[PDB]
Design a protein around this ligand. Structure first.
Ligand SMILES: *[C@@H]1O[C@H](CO)[C@@H](O[C@@H]2O[C@H](CO)[C@@H](O[C@@H]3O[C@H](CO[C@H]4O[C@H](CO)[C@@H](O)[C@H](O[C@H]5O[C@H](CO)[C@@H](O)[C@H](O)[C@@H]5O)[C@@H]4O)[C@@H](O)[C@H](O[C@H]4O[C@H](CO)[C@@H](O)[C@H](O)[C@@H]4O)[C@@H]3O)[C@H](O)[C@H]2NC(C)=O)[C@H](O)[C@H]1NC(C)=O
Ligand SMILES: *[C@@H]1O[C@H](CO)[C@@H](O)[C@H](O)[C@H]1NC(C)=O
Ligand SMILES: *[C@@H]1O[C@H](CO)[C@@H](O)[C@H](O)[C@H]1NC(C)=O
Ligand SMILES: *[C@@H]1O[C@H](CO)[C@@H](O)[C@H](O)[C@H]1NC(C)=O
Ligand SMILES: *[C@@H]1O[C@H](CO)[C@@H](O)[C@H](O)[C@H]1NC(C)=O
Ligand SMILES: *[C@@H]1O[C@H](CO)[C@@H](O)[C@H](O)[C@H]1NC(C)=O
Ligand SMILES: *[C@@H]1O[C@H](CO)[C@@H](O)[C@H](O)[C@H]1NC(C)=O
Ligand SMILES: *[C@@H]1O[C@H](CO)[C@@H](O)[C@H](O)[C@H]1NC(C)=O
Ligand SMILES: *[C@@H]1O[C@H](CO)[C@@H](O)[C@H](O)[C@H]1NC(C)=O
Ligand SMILES: *[C@@H]1O[C@H](CO)[C@@H](O)[C@H](O)[C@H]1NC(C)=O
Ligand SMILES: *[C@@H]1O[C@H](CO)[C@@H](O)[C@H](O)[C@H]1NC(C)=O
Lengths: 110, 128, 40, 126, 126, 126
């Protein structure tokens, strides 16, 4: 919706990608946390990264986060083959809900 | 670290209401919120709302407040730190625009700034 | 299925009132980590 | 709020860590059959208390309720993040997950104190 | 001078506050009828001592004889000037005038310690 | 090395001063005939321990194993050089050579603490 992501980006094995996540001042970013979700097509998602740069349990140290005053970034260091899916970002605070993003499909064809 | 199994693919038609179940296990059900999230065809994913099984309190987006029935049972304790819960979801004015996969999601923590964050999900239910 | 009264083992009597109770031992020492270290 | 004795038993470790003096008060006072059975209890209560005060004394934490040390947290003991311990788990859950390694830590907290004051005796040797 | 045990019992609170280790020594040692009556006394003496050492431990005064705190003196407890307390009244008179409010102060001296080290755990969290 | 309880009993005072927490652990726990004889022992063990912890508390050494003080070493007690004490004599030999003067030192370690905090109460009187 208002949280415009990075449309779509491609990659290659061993390299690192970057997904954008930015919106207007009403949802992003310095006064809101950002969460990143690996979401297979209409299946069971996975919380990767919460409270800007904090990683969920079991998340490989490849995924790193970074939130600026204007846009939040999700890096995927060292692309492994099992990475092709759609990544969503959500803006939230402590007593609110998830303002999901527009999605970004990542390809690893190499 | 438990499962959140849901109901089946109950495909109805506009006008009616649909009740979707969410039976928990493996974790203390009253310690984490149950978020409801949907990914329909026509939009992306949309956050519907979460409900606190302990406080009985409900918070849901204004896009679904006048549509969603969100209730919960009371856990049947299994062990000291385990239980089995049940969360129910309904929608009022149902259309073809609400066709999509629906999931429940246990909250992340019991305190802090990411308490209700949808962390542990179910498997999905295909609507109309 | 037929049921007949009886008893004798007098601990059944005390058990009918001590079912609500249970003895526990407090162990107040807990070790847990944080980003805290003492000075020099 | 004032939950009372063991009130935060089901609360997170971060919430319960603020209500320590509640359980600290009732650890020594309270919240001819049984004259020898009562005296047998009034002696046991002191011995259990002095053991816990003995370990606090040989760790440098004598008089402390929250005491920071020098032993770094071995991830082998529990590879859990900080925000998934104090804002999620209860102190009863934690004591189970650290049941085995609890004896290893008590020794590390000792020599880290005897070497510390041995360094301080040299710090004041001038 | 060396007045002895309770020697400054009739002296001003300022004079007696310098002779504290005198009464501190004889609080735990001293200045089959009675085999069970003697053992009943050797247990009571330790329990009374450990209670007083328990309160000193949860106030941050463990090991202190004169211990300064954070609780400001409520004038409702006693609206007496400083020079009309330590250079006029005796410690026996003072314990009577503060008999009621003595329990209020013991609680204030506790949370002022648990919040203090909770602030210190954050002071060393960097 | 780990010599064990009293392991460095024949070692120099400098070597044994590093193995203090070894003997500190087993001072309170351990390395109807005897029901009243056992209880008679479980009370004596606590009283001997609380006396040693009482002296440490009135010397300012509560919680310390190696504790530096203010009392200067009177050469009349022992006119031995520093390197002929810690690198030559054993703690058993030392306790004999200082057997007489041991009671004098315990009093000097007391008023040097009560005057110290009396000076600190004035240090914070502003
Ligand atoms: C027993 O176990 C249960 C379940 O584990 C514990 O309940 C959980 O407690 C934690 C903290 O105590 C809760 O986290 C907090 O969540 C609030 C969000 O609440 C706000 O929004 C709600 C929806 O709009 C609303 O209900 C709240 O309004 C009040 O009124 C309701 C009436 O229904 C009342 O029940 C509520 O309790 C509210 O008082 C409220 O507006 C969130 O705001 C908190 O974040 C703030 O605080 C933290 C620090 O505490 C801080 O880090 C943040 O930055 C922010 O400042 C906080 O996260 C959690 O929601 C509860 N429920 C769960 C986990 O399901 C219960 O506490 C345990 N009790 C004991 C005694 O052990
Ligand atoms: C749905 O919510 C309404 C709100 O008024 C409540 O009355 C009703 O009980 C809920 N549904 C069921 C089946 O209980
Ligand atoms: C962790 O503990 C093991 C033994 O349990 C030890 O061998 C290892 O060195 C420790 N690691 C750290 C980083 O302390
Ligand atoms: C979070 O905890 C994990 C242990 O499960 C650790 O590997 C990781 O480095 C921690 N991250 C932060 C930001 O503390
Ligand atoms: C402690 O040791 C036992 C040995 O039977 C083992 O089963 C248990 O898993 C250990 N504890 C933890 C937390 O791993
Ligand atoms: C004094 O004590 C009363 C209660 O006894 C309390 O209400 C008041 O706030 C206190 N005043 C000060 C200045 O501490
Ligand atoms: C003296 O004590 C009284 C209380 O009786 C107080 O009101 C006054 O301010 C004090 N004056 C000085 C100078 O301390
Ligand atoms: C303590 O309370 C009693 C209640 O009977 C009262 O008479 C007495 O005056 C109080 N103490 C003081 C110092 O006022
Ligand atoms: C040594 O002790 C004696 C009494 O035993 C005392 O008179 C003398 O002043 C002391 N000397 C020093 C230097 O402390
Ligand atoms: C060595 O000890 C003796 C006491 O026997 C003392 O007189 C002398 O000053 C000491 N010398 C040094 C260098 O410490
Ligand atoms: C202690 O006093 C006795 C008195 O009989 C004396 O023989 C002994 O030499 C004294 N101790 C020392 C170390 O001089």
């Amino acid at each position: 919706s208002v949280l415009t992501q990075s449309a779509s980006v491609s990659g290659s094995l061993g390299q690192s990608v970057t997904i954008s996540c930015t919106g207007p001042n009403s949802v992003c970013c310095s006064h809101k946390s950002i969460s990143w979700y690996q979401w297979p097509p209409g299946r069971a998602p996975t919380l990767i990264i919460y409270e800007d740069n904090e990683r969920a349990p079991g998340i490989s140290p490849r995924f790193s986060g970074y939130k600026s005053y204007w846009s939040a970034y999700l890096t995927i260091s060292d692309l492994r083959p099992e990475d092709e899916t759609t990544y969503y970002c959500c803006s939230y605070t402590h007593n609110s809900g998830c303002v999901f993003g527009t999605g970004t499909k990542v390809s690893v064809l190499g | 670290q438990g499962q959140l199994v849901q109901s089946g693919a109950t495909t109805t038609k506009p006008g009616s209401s649909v009740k979707i179940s969410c039976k928990t296990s493996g974790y203390r059900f009253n310690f984490y919120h149950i978020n409801w999230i949907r990914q329909t065809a026509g939009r992306g994913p949309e956050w519907m709302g979460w409900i606190s099984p302990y406080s009985g309190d409900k918070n849901l987006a204004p896009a679904f407040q006048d549509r969603v029935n969100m209730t919960t049972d009371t856990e049947v304790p299994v062990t000291s730190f385990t239980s089995t819960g049940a969360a129910y979801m309904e929608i009022r004015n149902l259309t073809s625009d609400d066709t999509g996969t629906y999931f429940c999601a246990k909250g992340l923590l019991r305190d802090g700034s990411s308490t209700w964050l949808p962390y542990l999900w179910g498997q999905g239910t295909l609507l109309t | 299925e037929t049921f007949r009264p009886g008893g004798g083992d007098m601990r059944d009597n005390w058990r009918s009132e001590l079912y609500k109770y249970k003895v526990v031992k407090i162990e107040p020492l807990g070790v847990a980590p944080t980003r805290c270290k003492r000075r020099v | 709020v004032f939950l009372g004795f063991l009130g935060a038993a089901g609360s997170t470790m971060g919430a319960a860590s603020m209500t320590l003096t509640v359980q600290a008060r009732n650890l020594l006072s309270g919240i001819t059959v049984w004259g020898i059975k009562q005296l047998q209890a009034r002696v046991l209560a002191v011995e259990r208390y002095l053991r816990d005060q003995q370990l606090l004394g040989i760790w440098g934490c004598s008089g402390k309720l929250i005491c920071c040390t020098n032993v770094p947290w071995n991830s082998s003991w529990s590879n859990r993040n900080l925000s998934e311990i104090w804002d999620n788990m209860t102190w009863l859950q934690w004591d189970k997950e650290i049941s085995n390694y609890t004896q290893i830590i008590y020794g590390l907290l000792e020599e880290s104190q005897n070497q510390q004051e041995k360094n301080e005796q040299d710090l004041l040797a001038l």
